Amino acid sequence: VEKCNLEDSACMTSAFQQALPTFVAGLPDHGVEVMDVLDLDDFAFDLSGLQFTLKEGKLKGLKGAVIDNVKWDLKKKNIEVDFHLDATVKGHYTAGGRILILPITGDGQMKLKLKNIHIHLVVSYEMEKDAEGVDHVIFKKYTVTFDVKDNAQFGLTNLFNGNKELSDTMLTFLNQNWKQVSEEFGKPVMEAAAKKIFKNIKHFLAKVPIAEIANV
């Protein structure tokens, strides 16, 4: 890793950028799972009238993320990371209920393409000495917000029992109302990914002395 003074944001931004692809490829012997393609645990939500499930979920694109800024605040003991990427979410979905003003049913495969999604991550940490006297950054909590800035496209198979007219109408509807759909339903999907990524970064930093990857 590129070593930085922690409050040198330009350095930290580059250091996160240069490490990211290698980190998200996974470090299996160290217990760090692959994060591109990231396997999502099975999840479901019931929000705004939509009942949705995703199994075998996959998130592609983190390897290609662009780090916009890293601000490590030693006083507050928080780290703010702003980044963006194109991503895809795939998996076996089910849908029921309604999407906004249209009824929906489906059970099939999904390919959701997200263009220029911006993510704002805040993490709280503590610097802790382990039983052997070695200092580590220990991540505690996080928050994430998102904004899909360019567009999102929805590919869903076997909507409406295979009915092409209804399926075409729904896919058109989703793509037309992509921003609203992202604001209604993005949070649970983001969380399925973020909880896994956070656990992996936390684990990695708990086992790598802070002195090995940063300057005091």
Which pair of structure tokens corresponds to residue 168?
């075409």
Using the rule CB under 6 A, is 104 a contact of ligand UQ8?
yes
Rule CB under 6 A: say whether 146 interacts with ligand UQ8. yes
Amino acid at 25: A
Under rule CB under 6 A, residue 152 binds ligand UQ8: yes
| Paired strand residues for 98 | 103
Q: Mention every residue, 6+ apart, whose C-beta is less than 8 A from residue 46.
A: 52, 97
8 A C-beta contact, residue 53 and residue 96:
no
Q: Which of residues 59-98 bind ligand UQ8 (CB under 6 A)?
A: 59, 81, 85, 87, 93, 95
d(CA 1, CA 212): 8
Q: Which is nearer to ligand UQ8, 4 or 90 (CB)?
A: 4
Cα(129)–Cα(50) distance, rounded to whole angstroms? 47
Q: Which is nearer to ligand UQ8, 19 or 134 (CB)?
A: 19
Based on the shown chain and the rule CB under 6 A, indicate whether residue 32 belongs to the binding site for ligand UQ8: no
Phi and psi, residue 163, nearest 5°: -75, 115
Number of residues that bind ligand UQ8 (CB under 6 A): 42
Q: Could you tell me which of 68, 70, 105 has the C-alpha nearest to residue 84?
A: 68
User: Shortest distance, CB of residue 22 to ligand UQ8, whole angstroms?
Assistant: 9
Q: How far is the CB of 178 from ligand UQ8 (least distance, A)?
A: 7
Place of tokens 């075998």: 56
Q: Which of residues 155-184 bind ligand UQ8 (CB under 6 A)?
A: 156, 181-182
- Report the distance separating Cα 15 and Cα 76, nearest Å: 21
Residues numbered 106 to 125 that lie near ligand UQ8 (CB under 6 A) are: 112, 114, 117, 119, 121
Long-range contacts of the stretch 170-175 (C-beta < 8 A, 24+): 170/99, 170/102, 170/104, 173/99, 173/100, 173/102, 174/99, 175/151
Of 25-33, 126-134, 161-169, 187-195, the segment contacting ligand UQ8 by CB under 6 A is 187-195
Residues that bind ligand UQ8 in the complex, under the rule CB under 6 A: 1, 4, 12, 15-16, 19-20, 23, 52, 59, 81, 85, 87, 93, 95, 99, 104, 112, 114, 117, 119, 121, 137, 144, 146, 148, 152, 154, 156, 181-182, 185-186, 189-190, 193-194, 197, 201, 205, 213-214
